[PDB]
Amino acid sequence: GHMKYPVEGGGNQDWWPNRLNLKVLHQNPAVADPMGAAFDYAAEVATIDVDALTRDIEEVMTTSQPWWPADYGHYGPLFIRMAWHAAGTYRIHDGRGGAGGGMQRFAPLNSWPDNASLDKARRLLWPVKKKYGKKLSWADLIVFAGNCALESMGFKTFGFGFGRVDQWEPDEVYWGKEATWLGDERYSGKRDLENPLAAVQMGLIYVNPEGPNGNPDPMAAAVDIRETFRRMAMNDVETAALIVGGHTFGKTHGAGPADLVGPEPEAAPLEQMGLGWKSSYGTGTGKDAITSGIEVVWTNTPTKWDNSFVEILYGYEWELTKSPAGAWQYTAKDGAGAGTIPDPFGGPGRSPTMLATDLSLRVDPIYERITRRWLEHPEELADEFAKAWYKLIHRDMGPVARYLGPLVPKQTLLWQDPVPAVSHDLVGEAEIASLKSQIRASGLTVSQLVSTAWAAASSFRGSDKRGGANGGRIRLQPQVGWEVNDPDGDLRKVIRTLEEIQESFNSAAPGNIKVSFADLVVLGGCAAIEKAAKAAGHNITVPFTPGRTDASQEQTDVESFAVLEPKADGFRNYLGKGNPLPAEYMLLDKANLLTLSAPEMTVLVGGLRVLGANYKRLPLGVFTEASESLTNDFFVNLLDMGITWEPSPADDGTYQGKDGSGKVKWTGSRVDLVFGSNSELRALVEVYGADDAQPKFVQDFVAAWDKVMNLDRFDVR
């Protein structure tokens, strides 16, 4: 090999391929943002003329462009595929992917094999982006176009929320280990798909349209469909409705041999203006288009909503055949239905065809019961598809406070993890100060209050904006039983004591002021940090913003919240089972899910350690003689060369720090020691460990703590 210039990718990872990469903590940096610090997308959206935008998109859909002519004179079906693929990268294990960031317009997503021809689809929408400018993000426009396509062709949607802020460099996500496009090294056992992946091959959205590993077995395909769609939060009914609703429209494209199609966009020459897959087969577009290599038109009305998909699926019998490009597909036996399917550009009619994965909807016994019902009750298909499409397009939107615009339906939905609206006045300064005194008098310790507030708030992940302290779900299933929240420990005791303080305050509060349990959990940790700071000689106030409300168990989908359980939390020195990488890599990944920077991660680790937030109160990394006071002792002692560190004499993967005499003075984990070992992290530790640093450390810790407490608080932003 050869090292390259940095402008062509060269860097330190070339010399140390397995090295920790702190760059995951400065994605989408502000310097790369052309918007400027004061840009307020929520304010811009609040002025869009949605009616005019809808009409402009309708005009785009029906004005064929010569560099990519419109099938059946309507770009609508292409836009529905575009939006489904935009939202279709989402996965429940880490919440990454989805349409919330407009990542389809960036690498690697813009060059995935499954996203072929969507470069043209996005390009066709520039006249709309041009007209509305900063008032309309690409992220919102890409999925709104699909929604507009559905409605222009006869399907009434449940609603739509704006508010996806455009980003300026791609979100870097692990999509699999395979170094070859469409590769498959992600299965073990019978058919166990590797966590956290939610597609069957590298570069696919969900499953292979020719069946598993190219084998058109519809029964086996249904196994992959059920599992990948499950990992995108869709059940059997939602999955069938989505696939039936989608393939009601449009067609596939495989008019000629695939080896006439040029490189994907990121590998394409300059003159192609960011487009890829340039084909030399005929015109390369339109009637000669090659996208997937399959040549299927599902229904006889590809630009209209109706029930002809299930009517055709159950109306014919199906046999295996090949497309002009050599891909497996199915067509009606016995020449049935010849000439009944229209051609996109006025040619002769064709025969009915289906993908192997479409036939899964009829061959799989669960899908068959669902889809056969819709033969005589298409009103139930329309209702399920509207609910599933709405959930698909908004899955990573977070709390409903973020949904913007005039098309947001206000019905509450269980999958949105709803919290009640506020129904009383909120606590003010005098009540907050009075609730703080009850907490100090309750006997709850700094460790208990800090650990409980962190456990509730650190369930947030910025990937799909789920979790957080709002809802007070730490006292509900499944969070109250999570191992890292330690049900065996004081958690139930802390919950009971906080509920007593809540009831006690609410029975004598002024006016109709009342405090929620969810607010009291956060307030307790804030009050404990104020006490711990004073105990170290710092008079500081921790910010506190009220307004969290208390969800009930009936409003908390227990199974849905399973994916939010921390399998690792280096901020509590906790490492569960099943993590893909050593503990210091999972620490950085956890900090990324919390939207934390490297300095913010560093102050929080050092602070939480000396506050007693550790899992099971382990002494690992507690480099202080003044526990439960907020000092910078963690950083001072970590940089002390009077300590000699060694792997423990037990073979448990921890470390022993010995002083000059040989006595073990400290113990620590990989998460603890990486801050004194990694050269970029140690640079940060040396800032907070200096003689002048303790006021700055306390200030920075409180700021990072306040950030974590407020991660899900879009209701007051």
Active site positions, annotated: 85, 298
Alpha carbons 232 and 253: distance in angstroms, whole number: 26
Q: Of 101-109, 310-318, 455-463, 537-545, which segment contacts a second copy by CB under 8 A? A: 101-109
In the bound complex, what is the minimum distance in angstroms from residue 218's beta carbon to ligand HEM? 11
* Total residues in contact with a second copy, by rule CB under 8 A: 113
The rounded radius of gyration (Å) of the Cα atoms in the chain is 28
Which parts are annotated binding residues? 247
Among 149, 676, 702, 713, binds a second copy (CB under 8 A): 676
CB of 210 to a second copy, least distance (A): 23
Query: How many angstroms separate the CA atoms of 125 and 143, rounded?
Result: 11
Handedness of CA 143, 144, 149, 154 (dihedral sign): positive
Q: Is the torsion defined by CA of 271, 276, 280, 282 positive or negative?
A: negative
Can you read off the two tokens belonging to residue 381? 């298909």
Q: Is 176 in the site for a second copy (CB under 8 A)?
A: yes
The single-letter DSSP state of residue 426 is P
Min. distance of Cβ 358 from ligand HEM in angstroms? 8
Residue pair 186/197 in contact (Cβ under 8 Å)? The answer is: yes
Range 605-629 burial, b when 16+ CB lie within 10 A, else e = bbbbbbbbbbbeeeebbbbbeebbb
Residue from 30, 46, 52, 320 in contact with a second copy (CB under 8 A): 30
In terms of Cβ atoms closer than 10 Å to its own Cβ (0-12, 13-18, 19+), residue 330 is: buried
Which range binds ligand HEM by CB under 6 A, 131-139, 256-264, 287-295, 693-701? Answer: 287-295
Half-sphere exposure of 45 (CA within 13 A, CB side): 21
Of the residues 396, 417, 550, 712, which one makes contact with Na ion according to CB under 5 A: 396
Our CB check for ligand HEM shows the closer of 354 and 601 to be: 354
Q: Residue 143 Cβ, how far from a second copy at the closest point, in Å?
A: 17
Residues with Cβ < 8 Å from 691, sequence gap 6 or more?
none
Q: For the segment 682-701, give every residue that binds a second copy (CB under 8 A).
A: 682-684, 686-693, 700
Binding-site residue numbers for heme b are: 247
Q: What binding mask, one character per residue, do residues 338-377 give for ligand HEM by CB under 6 A, x or -? A: -------------------x--------------------
x/- binding map, residues 644-673, to a second copy, per CB under 8 A?
A: xxxx-------x--------------x--x
Site string for ligand HEM, 227-266 (x = CB under 6 A): ---------------xx-xxx-xxxxx-------------
Residue placing its CB nearer to a second copy in the complex, 123 or 617: 123
- One of 598, 617, 618, 628 touching a second copy (CB under 8 A): 598
246 interacts with, out of ligand HEM, Na ion, a second copy, none, CB within 5 to 8 A per kind: ligand HEM
Contact flag: residue 94 with Na ion (CB under 5 A): no
DSSP result, 602-670? HHHHHHHHHHT-SGGG--TT---SSTTS--SHHHHHHT-TT-EEEE-SSSSS-EEEE-SSS-EEEEE-H
Number of residues that bind Na ion (CB under 5 A): 5
Contact 370, 237 (CB under 8 A): yes
Residue 84 interacts with ligand HEM (CB under 6 A): yes or no: yes
Given the rule CB under 8 A, which of 72-80, 133-141, 216-224, 373-381 is the region that contacts a second copy? 133-141
* Shortest Å distance, C-beta 247 to ligand HEM: 6
User: Is 277 near ligand HEM (CB under 6 A)?
Assistant: no
318 sits in which H/E element: strand 318-322
Residue 395 as a binder of ligand HEM (CB under 6 A): the answer is no
Binders of a second copy among residues 506 to 535 (CB under 8 A) are none
* CA separation for the pair 35, 55 (Å, rounded): 27
168 touches a second copy (CB under 8 A): yes
The yes or no reply on residue 589 touching Na ion (CB under 5 A) is no
Inter-residue contact 471 to 552 (CB < 8 Å): no
- Looking at residue 427, the DSSP 8-state letter turns out to be P
Distance CA 248, CA 298 (A): 7
| Shortest distance in whole angstroms from residue 641 CB to a second copy | 6
CB 542 within 8 A of CB 706: yes
Closest contact distance (angstroms) between CB of 144 and ligand HEM is 15
**Alpha carbons 658 and 642: distance in angstroms, whole number:** 8
Tokens of 630: 């907020």
Q: Which stretch binds ligand HEM (CB under 6 A): 76-84, 276-284, 486-494, 698-706?
A: 76-84
Token pair 């990324």: residue: 592
Distance CA 97, CA 441 (A): 46
Residues 241, 234: Cα–Cα separation, whole Å? 10
614-643 positions binding a second copy, by CB under 8 A: 639, 641
Calculate the alpha carbon distances from 483 to 2, 439, 489, 565, 575 in Å. Answer: 47, 25, 10, 9, 10
Residue 477's binding partner among a second copy, Na ion, ligand HEM, none (Cβ under 5 to 8 angstroms by kind) is: none
Supply the minimum distance, in Å, between the C-beta of residue 367 and ligand HEM: 11
| Candidate segments 187-195, 398-406, 462-470, 485-493, binder of Na ion by CB under 5 A | 462-470
CB of 142 to a second copy, least distance (A): 13
| Helices and strands of the chain, counted as H and E runs | 23, 10
**Residue from 21, 157, 301, 442 that binds a second copy (CB under 8 A)?**
21
Q: Quick one: tokens of 47?
A: 């002025």
Q: Which does 81 bind (CB under 5 to 8 A by kind): ligand HEM, Na ion, a second copy, none?
A: ligand HEM
**Distance, C-alpha 516 to centroid of its chain:** 28
Name the site residues for ligand HEM (rule: CB under 6 A).
71, 77-78, 80-81, 84, 117, 206-207, 209, 225, 242-243, 245-247, 249-253, 291-292, 294, 357
Name the site residues for Na ion (rule: CB under 5 A).
96, 98, 396, 463-464
